[PDB]
Amino acid sequence: SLIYAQILAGMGNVSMPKQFLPLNGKPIIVHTVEKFILNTRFDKILISSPKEWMNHAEDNIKKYISDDRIVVIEGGEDRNETIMNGIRFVEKTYGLTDDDIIVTHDAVRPFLTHRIIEENIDAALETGAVDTVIEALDTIVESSNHEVITDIPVRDHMYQGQTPQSFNMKKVFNHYQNLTPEKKQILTDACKICLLAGDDVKLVKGEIFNIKITTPYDLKVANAIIQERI
Amino acid sequence: SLIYAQILAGMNVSMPKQFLPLNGKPIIVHTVEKFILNTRFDKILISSPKEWMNHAEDNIKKYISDDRIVVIEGGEDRNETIMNGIRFVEKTYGLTDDDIIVTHDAVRPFLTHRIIEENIDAALETGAVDTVIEALDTIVESSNHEVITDIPVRDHMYQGQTPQSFNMKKVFNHYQNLTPEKKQILTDACKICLLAGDDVKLVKGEIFNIKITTPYDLKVANAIIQERI
C-alpha cells in the first residue's frame, strides 16, 4: 500500500503551461509541489509535463525544491491519458499492487491545504475514488437547449468540482480501459467514469480559495489571496 | 409599456455590503451608475432595510443627480422585497400588463450595458429572464452530501447571476399563488416562473459579473477595476 501523487495540467496546443508563471516571485508549480512535499505519506510525487517542457520542468523544480521523490514524466493528450501514463510509469518503474493509491491534482491549484491532501489520501484507501468539492457558490441552472431554463435543482445537492481527485490506481486504470473509443472522448472527468462503473466516489470538502489559475481574472483572484497570508 | 429597475441588497444587524467603498466610492454607486446610463428605465428603485434608508438616500444623491432614483423599503425576503417594489410602483405610478422590472444585486457593480439591454428586451418578449454564465467548474450532484450521485452533462450546466427580469404582473401573480411554505422554500424568483410554466429566457452574463460578499470576493473586484482605467 504505497501512496503516490500526480501533478498535472491541460491556445492551439503550443502556449507555455500556465503553472510556469510566477506568483509572488516563484512559479505556480512550485507553490503546488511544496504542499505535496510537506505530506510525508507520499512515496513518489509525479509531475506531468508535455514533451517540450519536460527539461524546463525538471530544472525549474530542482532549483526551488530538493526533495528526492519528485519525478518529471511525460504527459498525454487527454487529462485521462496523462493519468494512465502516470499509472503506467509507476508499474514499469516501481511495480503496482492492489492497494496503491494516486492523488491527482491541478498544477495551477496552488492553494490546497494539508487537510485536503490528508482527507484525499484517507478516502482513496477507504473507497478507491474521491472528488474534492465545495458547495456551489452560485445558483445552478440547467438548460438542455441553451435558450431557456429546463431546471433549477435543489441548492444543497449542488457542488462545485475542484481537485485533488484520488483513486485506487488499478481500479481507475481498469475502468478507463474498459470504455469504448467514443466513450473515452466524452468522459473527461475520471470521477464520473468510476461513478458510471458503480464505484462510490466519496467527497472531500475543498476551499473557496482552492482556485484554478487560468485566466488573468483567475491570476489576480490568486493575488488577492497570497498577500494577506504572510 | 414602462420599464423599471430594482436594485436589491440582502448578522441581521450587519451594514449592507453595498455601502463599502470600491476604488474610492460606494459599491451601490458603481451599480446604480450602469442603470442610469440606460435611458429606457422610467424609475430606478433602490431597496434598503428601514434603518439604512436615510443613508442610502443621502449617499446616492451626493454621487448621482438623476431624477428617477427612489429609495424604498425592503422586505425580510428577497422575493418580498421584489413584491414591495411592485407594490410601490402600483401605488405611486400605476401598473399595466406590459410593465417590466429588471431586478439586480446591489453588490454586482460590473454588469455591462449589453447585459442590461438584453434583460430589458427578453422581459418584454417572455416576461421572465435569468442572467447566467456557463459553469466555470464541473458541477457534481450529491443528495446525501457524502458520495457523488450524479455528474450531469457539462454543456447543460449554468451558474446564476443577476439581473433577473420579469413582467411585473406575471411574477406578482405567480408568487401570490404559492402556498405559505412554498414561499419560504422557493427563494429564486426565476424558479417560481419556471414551475408556473413560463419560459425563463437566458441572457449570458460575464465571468466578472461577480457578487461582492466575502473578503475573497472584494479583492477579486479590486483585480477587475484597476486594469480598466
Q: How far is CA A86 from CA A68, A73, A173, in A?
A: 18, 8, 10
Contacts of A147 in chain B (CB under 8 A): 201-202
Question: In this complex, do B220 and A224 lie within 8 Å of one another by their Cβ atoms?
Answer: yes
Are B183 and B107 in contact by the 8 Å Cβ rule? The answer is no
CB-based contacts of A195: which residues, under 8 Å, 6+ apart?
Answer: A129, A201, B148, B150, B151
- Name the closest residue on chain A to residue B158, using Cα atoms: A141
Amino acid type, A180: T
Question: In this complex, do A195 and B158 lie within 8 Å of one another by their Cβ atoms?
Answer: no
Are B26 and B59 in contact by the 8 Å Cβ rule? The answer is yes
DSSP secondary structure, A189-204, as one string: -HHHHHHHHT---EEE
Tell me the pairing of strands A140-142 and B25-26. unpaired
Are A24 and A226 in contact by the 8 Å Cβ rule? The answer is yes
Helix, strand or coil, per DSSP, at residue A62: helix
Prior bond to B152 cis, omega within 30? Answer: no
Q: How far is CA A58 from CA A37, A84, B109, B168, in A?
A: 15, 21, 44, 62
Grid coordinates given for A226: 497570497
Contacts of A188 in chain B (CB under 8 A): 154
What's the rounded Cα separation, in Å, for the pair A229 and B67?
45
CB atoms under 10 Å from CB of A60, counted, come to 19
What's the rounded Cα separation, in Å, for the pair B214 and A200?
33
Tell me the pairing of strands B100-105 and B157-167. antiparallel
CB-based contacts of B5: which residues, under 8 Å, 6+ apart?
Answer: B35, B38, B41, B43, B44, B45, B101, B102, B103, B104
Amino acid type, B114: R
Grid coordinates given for B223: 483585480
Question: In this complex, do B223 and A220 lie within 8 Å of one another by their Cβ atoms?
Answer: yes
Exposed / middle / buried, residue B52 (Cβ in 10 Å: 0-12, 13-18, 19+): middle
A127 labelled binding-site residue: no
**Chain A / chain B CB contacts < 8 angstroms:** 120
Residue-range definition of the domain harbouring residue B179? 1-229
Query: For chain B, what is the domain count?
Result: 1
Question: In this complex, do B141 and A162 lie within 8 Å of one another by their Cβ atoms?
Answer: no
Are B113 and B37 in contact by the 8 Å Cβ rule? The answer is yes
Any alpha helices (H) in chain B, and if so which ranges?
Answer: 27-36, 53-63, 78-92, 113-125, 168-176, 180-185, 189-195, 215-228
Any alpha helices (H) in B11-154, and if so which ranges?
Answer: 27-36, 53-63, 78-92, 113-125
Grid coordinates given for A199: 464505484
Resolution in A: 2.3
CB atoms under 10 Å from CB of A26, counted, come to 14
What's the rounded Cα separation, in Å, for the pair A94 and A100?
11
CATH code at position A26: 3.90.550.10
